Write a protein that binds this DNA or RNA. Structure first.
Length: 177
RNA sequence: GGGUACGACCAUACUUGGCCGGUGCACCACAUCCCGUCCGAUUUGUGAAGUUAAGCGGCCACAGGCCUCGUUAGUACGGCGAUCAGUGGCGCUGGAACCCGGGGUGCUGCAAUC
């Protein structure tokens, strides 16, 4: 399916004051289902880092970021996450995908299973595309070879839904349902 | 600008130890009387020889304290929420203190006065 997580870049600042007349603007890449969550995660880091809070700031740009292309490539996602079982595991897993958004959402499902880690426990720390060689991880390294061929072994080929059937004659594909 | 009296706030004006120095302030002289003590030390009355030593006030403390703001720290804790997880995160939110550091170390009022 298309990626779970859209790629937002939320930009914002603490709102101007005589206390801080010309406040720093903050860019912040997020991978969120939708902007309202990206805007939220953005204000999470604003208070967890800048001590500025949602009441006192103002997002200047919620906009989603355009995909680099569509060619299959290779992503080093850097993903801190939390648990009672582990309170802050920095962890640069690599994923092979067509987009930063896809590598990242792929990193959430991966991270949610190997670690019972919800979206809001996780925080992406960056998602570089990587060249073939830099990927130390051995799993996706199997897919680098320009000459890689593999079988689609032991397929379950379900019929197109329009054609699916409950009962069929045994060495035939006459329907009987 | 300072001094006096009476002050308001009552340490930024406090404690310590320095140094600094025209009205007055002070210390200072004596106690006859008013008046009071074991004692004129205190207090009281009467003075004006002496001196600023002190008090006083002002300036200095890698002074302490106090005040102020930052750091701490979106930390601690907290309110609300979940068919959350197994105390904790999370979502919406409010949000310190100790500490350390920068600064600071009284200010205003009436009255007569140099």
């Amino acid at each position: 399916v298309k990626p779970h997580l859209r790629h937002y870049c939320v930009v914002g600042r603490e709102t101007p004051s005589e206390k801080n007349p010309a406040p720093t603007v903050y860019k912040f890449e997020v991978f969120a289902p939708n902007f309202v969550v990206a805007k939220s995660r953005f204000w999470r880091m604003m208070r967890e880092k800048n001590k500025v809070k949602s009441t006192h700031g103002d997002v200047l740009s919620c906009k989603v970021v355009k995909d680099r292309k569509l060619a299959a490539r290779n992503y080093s996602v850097d993903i801190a996450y939390y648990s009672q079982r582990c309170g802050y595991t920095h962890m640069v897993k690599e994923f092979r995908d067509v987009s930063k958004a896809g590598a990242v959402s792929q990193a959430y499902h991966d991270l949610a299973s190997r670690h019972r880690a919800r979206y809001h426990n996780i925080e992406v720390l960056g998602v570089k595309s990587i060249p073939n060689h830099q990927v130390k991880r051995l799993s996706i390294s199997e897919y680098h070879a320009s000459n890689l061929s593999f079988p689609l072994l032991h397929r379950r080929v379900k019929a197109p839904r329009k054609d699916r059937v409950v009962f069929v004659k045994k060495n035939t594909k006459r329907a009987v349902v």
